[PDB]
Design an enzyme around this catalytic site. Structure first.
Site, PDB file in Angstrom:
ATOM      1  NE  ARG A 131      -8.821 -31.390  22.542  1.00 56.84           N
ATOM      2  CZ  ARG A 131      -9.515 -32.286  23.234  1.00 56.84           C
ATOM      3  NH1 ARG A 131      -9.365 -33.574  22.976  1.00 56.84           N
ATOM      4  NH2 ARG A 131     -10.343 -31.888  24.197  1.00 56.84           N
ATOM      5  CD1 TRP A 163      -2.077 -19.666  19.818  1.00 57.78           C
ATOM      6  CD2 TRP A 163      -1.271 -20.322  17.836  1.00 57.78           C
ATOM      7  NE1 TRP A 163      -3.149 -19.941  19.005  1.00 57.78           N
ATOM      8  CE2 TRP A 163      -2.682 -20.351  17.782  1.00 57.78           C
ATOM      9  CE3 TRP A 163      -0.545 -20.706  16.705  1.00 57.78           C
ATOM     10  CZ2 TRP A 163      -3.378 -20.740  16.644  1.00 57.78           C
ATOM     11  CZ3 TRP A 163      -1.234 -21.085  15.574  1.00 57.78           C
ATOM     12  CH2 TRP A 163      -2.640 -21.102  15.551  1.00 57.78           C
TER      13      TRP A 163
HETATM   14  C1  HEM Z   1      -2.129 -23.875  18.574  1.00 62.64           C
HETATM   15  C2  HEM Z   1      -2.664 -23.441  19.722  1.00 62.64           C
HETATM   16  C3  HEM Z   1      -2.750 -24.277  21.028  1.00 62.64           C
HETATM   17  C4  HEM Z   1      -3.230 -23.789  22.175  1.00 62.64           C
HETATM   18  C5  HEM Z   1      -3.762 -22.351  22.358  1.00 62.64           C
HETATM   19  C6  HEM Z   1      -3.164 -24.818  23.193  1.00 62.64           C
HETATM   20  C7  HEM Z   1      -3.574 -24.715  24.512  1.00 62.64           C
HETATM   21  C8  HEM Z   1      -3.324 -25.635  25.510  1.00 62.64           C
HETATM   22  C9  HEM Z   1      -3.407 -25.396  26.932  1.00 62.64           C
HETATM   23  C10 HEM Z   1      -3.817 -24.055  27.558  1.00 62.64           C
HETATM   24  C11 HEM Z   1      -3.092 -26.524  27.577  1.00 62.64           C
HETATM   25  C12 HEM Z   1      -3.032 -26.725  29.103  1.00 62.64           C
HETATM   26  C13 HEM Z   1      -1.556 -26.911  29.450  1.00 62.64           C
HETATM   27  C14 HEM Z   1      -1.252 -26.586  30.889  1.00 62.64           C
HETATM   28  O1  HEM Z   1      -2.009 -25.796  31.508  1.00 62.64           O
HETATM   29  O2  HEM Z   1      -0.241 -27.111  31.420  1.00 62.64           O
HETATM   30  C15 HEM Z   1      -2.782 -27.529  26.583  1.00 62.64           C
HETATM   31  C16 HEM Z   1      -2.404 -28.835  26.821  1.00 62.64           C
HETATM   32  C17 HEM Z   1      -2.028 -29.770  25.876  1.00 62.64           C
HETATM   33  N1  HEM Z   1      -1.942 -29.547  24.515  1.00 62.64           N
HETATM   34 FE1  HEM Z   1      -2.476 -27.852  23.510  1.00 62.64          FE
HETATM   35  N2  HEM Z   1      -2.623 -25.942  22.601  1.00 62.64           N
HETATM   36  C18 HEM Z   1      -2.349 -25.655  21.270  1.00 62.64           C
HETATM   37  C19 HEM Z   1      -1.792 -26.544  20.366  1.00 62.64           C
HETATM   38  C20 HEM Z   1      -1.418 -27.852  20.612  1.00 62.64           C
HETATM   39  C21 HEM Z   1      -0.622 -28.702  19.745  1.00 62.64           C
HETATM   40  C22 HEM Z   1      -0.047 -28.236  18.387  1.00 62.64           C
HETATM   41  C23 HEM Z   1      -0.479 -29.899  20.355  1.00 62.64           C
HETATM   42  C24 HEM Z   1       0.260 -31.170  19.862  1.00 62.64           C
HETATM   43  C25 HEM Z   1       0.602 -31.384  18.588  1.00 62.64           C
HETATM   44  C26 HEM Z   1      -1.202 -29.850  21.618  1.00 62.64           C
HETATM   45  C27 HEM Z   1      -1.328 -30.869  22.550  1.00 62.64           C
HETATM   46  C28 HEM Z   1      -1.529 -30.712  23.909  1.00 62.64           C
HETATM   47  C29 HEM Z   1      -1.355 -31.708  24.950  1.00 62.64           C
HETATM   48  C30 HEM Z   1      -0.910 -33.173  24.765  1.00 62.64           C
HETATM   49  C31 HEM Z   1      -1.657 -31.149  26.121  1.00 62.64           C
HETATM   50  C32 HEM Z   1      -1.591 -31.855  27.493  1.00 62.64           C
HETATM   51  C33 HEM Z   1      -0.329 -31.320  28.169  1.00 62.64           C
HETATM   52  C34 HEM Z   1      -0.077 -31.949  29.514  1.00 62.64           C
HETATM   53  O3  HEM Z   1      -0.750 -32.964  29.847  1.00 62.64           O
HETATM   54  O4  HEM Z   1       0.811 -31.425  30.240  1.00 62.64           O
HETATM   55  N3  HEM Z   1      -1.756 -28.591  21.734  1.00 62.64           N
HETATM   56  N4  HEM Z   1      -2.940 -26.950  25.336  1.00 62.64           N
HETATM   57  C1  LIG Z   2       2.952 -26.629  31.312  1.00 56.86           C
HETATM   58  N1  LIG Z   2       2.391 -26.440  29.964  1.00 56.86           N
HETATM   59  C2  LIG Z   2       3.478 -26.499  28.973  1.00 56.86           C
HETATM   60  C3  LIG Z   2       3.031 -25.816  27.684  1.00 56.86           C
HETATM   61  C4  LIG Z   2       1.584 -26.177  27.383  1.00 56.86           C
HETATM   62  C5  LIG Z   2       1.166 -25.809  25.976  1.00 56.86           C
HETATM   63  C6  LIG Z   2       1.549 -26.603  24.906  1.00 56.86           C
HETATM   64  C7  LIG Z   2       1.151 -26.271  23.619  1.00 56.86           C
HETATM   65  C8  LIG Z   2       1.566 -27.138  22.461  1.00 56.86           C
HETATM   66  C9  LIG Z   2       0.358 -25.152  23.423  1.00 56.86           C
HETATM   67  C10 LIG Z   2      -0.008 -24.381  24.522  1.00 56.86           C
HETATM   68  N2  LIG Z   2      -0.767 -23.269  24.360  1.00 56.86           N
HETATM   69  N3  LIG Z   2       0.398 -24.725  25.762  1.00 56.86           N
END
Ligand code: HEM
Ligand SMILES: CNCCCc1cc(C)cc(N)n1
Ligand code: HEM
Ligand SMILES: C[C@H](O)[C@H](O)[C@H]1CNc2nc(N)[nH]c(=O)c2N1
Ligand SMILES: C[C@H](O)[C@H](O)[C@H]1CNc2nc(N)[nH]c(=O)c2N1
Ligand SMILES: CNCCCc1cc(C)cc(N)n1
Ligand SMILES: [Cl-]
Ligand SMILES: [Cl-]
Ligand SMILES: [Gd]
Ligand SMILES: [Gd]
Ligand SMILES: [Gd]
Ligand SMILES: [Zn+2]
Lengths: 400, 402
Positions: free
Chosen positions: A107, A276
């Site tokens: 974030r 990404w």
């Molecule tokens: C740009 C680089 C980003 C990286 C490196 C990143 C990384 C991550 C990672 C590692 C997770 C854990 C997901 C999992 O293990 O299943 C996650 C979850 C999440 N991300 Fe990000 N993210 C990025 C951008 C974003 C963006 C652009 C959004 C929305 C506009 C976002 C919203 C969320 C949400 C809502 C979750 C919860 C997913 C769930 O509950 O399954 N992220 N993110």
């Molecule tokens: C089971 N997770 C699905 C993909 C999770 C994810 C979402 C976003 C927006 C970024 C990221 N780095 N990773």
């Protein structure tokens, strides 16, 4: 106001933001459920709150334009039963939900997000091209760019825009003459639905699934993806020459297409967001989880490791090298990817940012700490407070 | 009743045991505080003791019997007359095992029934306390074939101060504030080290100087006692294929013996009841040696391994820490000193959760403490949802007596 400590440095903060938490979480004084994955005119309370947020942010509390916009939504709900969001609001709200996502470690990027407003969408062959613009935009030849496309806000008496896949890119999974799965087992079910709805299944282990896209009340419709638009990376290791022969690949764009954006009390059951990858997502969960690709023992044989005793740490060595290959492969292909050290350090930076700005930050400890080398990253040693702020991304039941 | 899923397999169970959670923890529906390390009259002593005795009589298949109501009335008549009561010896043994069983942050609980209980409730002085402690260390160490043990010193009671062990563990290494502003030794132990000197200990100046004990008798200042060297079994750390590793000079001790926690049994409080098991390799190899605020050897190892430490994406931190853990496992196995790796430990903890669901309908467990600090999702506990709650009997935190 909860006291929060970092144990690596000894510093103390207080999460004053935690006081705003609306949608109460799953925990009680009696028990903690922090580790569990999935634990009419009220519509105006959530819209009042969101609009007040917008103006405060642009330093516009208590003013003419602030007064003014409260009334139009007042009248809009009075006549029609809902409302429409001003363009800038939909943008402000899309960024806030990201900023509020407790399980996202990336974030620090929350302020840089590209919002494609598809609210005037009207069909499935329409859906497909909005999705197809987004993908090709966010991919950007590997120089990945965060994007969210927002489809029509759901209304009563009419169906729903929904993407039936969990992500825009997903690999197939097929049972066999012995029940077990060739391909990715996280998508065995949605594969079965696609094969049902007409799709000819491949033989391969990395078949990119066709999108089941569904417009209100009309059934889904398969939508084969343009293979030149699905940017992928073959996996090779920098020094283990045989790793390439294993034939592994992963896609470039992580795009989540089953969550339900919620701004100002309005629910968008179709709003794919993309960014990404963090390498551990691919190299640790996707490839090594027992119930996913489960490749860990196969890489350990090829490394001539001693799989006969767990105290050789052969699981740990093979896992590290699978992650090295991911970072190496993606970097060779010039696809944006970030390692779990770089990424957690940037999240620590984010927490201090959010401390001065909003007085805290909802973070889910079990999801911020990476699935390998947890205590080697700074967030391990950071206490965290988890709670629900609006606007947000929420889970939603599958459309069946 | 909370539904709890295992994501590796698809198992689903409900935790009815959580319904009986005795005390309260720090979370509310507003907000979770699970990741915080420290989340914190006769009638109420009566209903606590009533609950424990009910427990004790259930374990011996005597619930609702003559002997069962006899003990109840005995305890009531004694709190009436004295404001407190005494545990029977067998009640004490059951009470200490339950406390181990109930401890949400212990991954080794498969062993909870194999515990040696030394009744030291007749202890009189710090000097007798010291002798009891040496006998504990001697029996538990067992020349490297470690055994689970707890020694129980006199309970808290009206009229007299507490027994206390001021040291957080029976074996700890000194930490000396230094020339620059650094620490020589273990930085977790600067305060206790300052205290020992301030009470007459002559400081060493190595990195692995074993600390003396500060033992506190009721209404007495603490008294310094040096541990006989031949009684603290240590392990020199070497790496099976990295021969320069032995030139680091690293050591660790055999016996993990936590000594600053409070044992609570049916409302009674034992502020001095040190307990000991055997180590899981990650406590030493990951946390104690690699934590930035602990011995912090990660970068030095990595350079020695000729890893490229200028970019994070080379995963030098990951590779160096895996080798430090390897060295710990090999050194303890070479020295014939009991040790379990995080894979073996977490797998056996999965059997414990299965035993506990059949036996009690669930198990209290602090996910962030059970999941190992390296290779988390490579172990089966990562993929297992858990319910965290407080049952009694229990080991609780208590403040430092200074
Ligand atoms: C740009 C680089 C980003 C990286 C490196 C990143 C990384 C991550 C990672 C590692 C997770 C854990 C997901 C999992 O293990 O299943 C996650 C979850 C999440 N991300 Fe990000 N993210 C990025 C951008 C974003 C963006 C652009 C959004 C929305 C506009 C976002 C919203 C969320 C949400 C809502 C979750 C919860 C997913 C769930 O509950 O399954 N992220 N993110
Ligand atoms: C089971 N997770 C699905 C993909 C999770 C994810 C979402 C976003 C927006 C970024 C990221 N780095 N990773
Ligand atoms: C026999 C082998 C044992 C193993 C392998 C084991 C494993 C562990 C580990 C790895 C921790 C976490 C420590 C940390 O990260 O700081 C822990 C915590 C704990 N264990 Fe065990 N344990 C064993 C025996 C025991 C015994 C005999 C008792 C008590 C009678 C006990 C009670 C506890 C308690 C109270 C905690 C939490 C301590 C704290 O909160 O600081 N364990 N255990
Ligand atoms: C049971 C446990 O809560 C579950 O496996 C969680 C733990 N932390 C996680 N963290 C991330 N980022 N992704 C996950 O799928 C999970 N799984
Ligand atoms: C702040 C965070 O809760 C803290 O670093 C915890 C995380 N999990 C842990 N788990 C174990 N087993 N031991 C610990 O000391 C910690 N520390
Ligand atoms: C901060 N806790 C330090 C010692 C923890 C511990 C205690 C016991 C009894 C066993 C073990 N394997 N580990
Ligand atoms: Cl993924
Ligand atoms: Cl320790
Ligand atoms: Gd070979
Ligand atoms: Gd060598
Ligand atoms: Gd050196
Ligand atoms: Zn909680």
């Amino acid at each position: 106001f909860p006291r929060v400590k970092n144990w690596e440095v000894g510093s103390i903060t207080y999460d004053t933001l935690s006081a705003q938490a609306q949608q109460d979480g799953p925990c009680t004084p009696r028990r903690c459920l922090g580790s569990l994955v999935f634990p009419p005119e009220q519509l105006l309370s959530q819209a009042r709150d969101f609009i007040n947020q917008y103006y405060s942010s642009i330093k516009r509390s208590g003013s003419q334009a602030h007064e003014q916009r409260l009334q139009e939504v007042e009248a809009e709900v009075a006549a029609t039963g809902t409302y429409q969001l001003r363009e800038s609001e939909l943008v402000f709200g899309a960024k806030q939900a990201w900023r509020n996502a407790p399980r996202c470690v990336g974030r620090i990027q929350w302020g840089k997000l590209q919002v494609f407003d598809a609210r005037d969408c009207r069909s499935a062959q329409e859906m497909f091209t909005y999705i197809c613009n987004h993908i090709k935009y966010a991919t950007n030849r590997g120089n990945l760019r965060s994007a969210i496309t927002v489809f029509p806000q759901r209304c009563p008496g009419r169906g729903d825009f929904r993407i039936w896949n969990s992500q825009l890119v997903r690999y197939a999974g097929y049972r066999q003459q012995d029940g077990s799965v060739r391909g990715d087992p996280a998508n065995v079910e949605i594969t079965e639905l696609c094969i049902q709805h007409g799709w000819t299944p491949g033989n391969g282990r990395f078949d990119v699934l066709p999108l089941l896209l569904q417009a209100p009340d009309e059934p889904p419709e398969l939508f084969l993806l343009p293979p030149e638009l699905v940017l992928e990376v073959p996996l090779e290791h920098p020094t283990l020459e045989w790793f390439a022969a294993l034939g592994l690949r992963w896609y470039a764009l992580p795009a989540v297409s089953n969550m339900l954006l919620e701004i100002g009390g309005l629910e968008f059951p179709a709003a794919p967001f993309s960014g990404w990858y963090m390498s551990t997502e691919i190299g640790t969960r996707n490839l090594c989880d027992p119930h996913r690709y489960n490749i860990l023992e196969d890489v350990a044989v090829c490394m001539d490791l001693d799989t006969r005793t767990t105290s050789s740490l052969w699981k740990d060595k093979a896992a590290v090298e699978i992650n090295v290959a991911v970072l190496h492969s993606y970097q060779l292909a010039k696809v944006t990817i970030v390692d779990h050290h770089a990424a957690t350090a940037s999240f620590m930076k984010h927490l201090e940012n959010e401390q001065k700005a909003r007085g805290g930050c909802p973070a889910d400890w079990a999801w911020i700490v990476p699935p390998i080398s947890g205590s080697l990253t700074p967030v391990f040693h950071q206490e965290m407070v988890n709670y629900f702020l609006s606007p947000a991304f929420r889970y939603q039941p599958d459309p069946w």
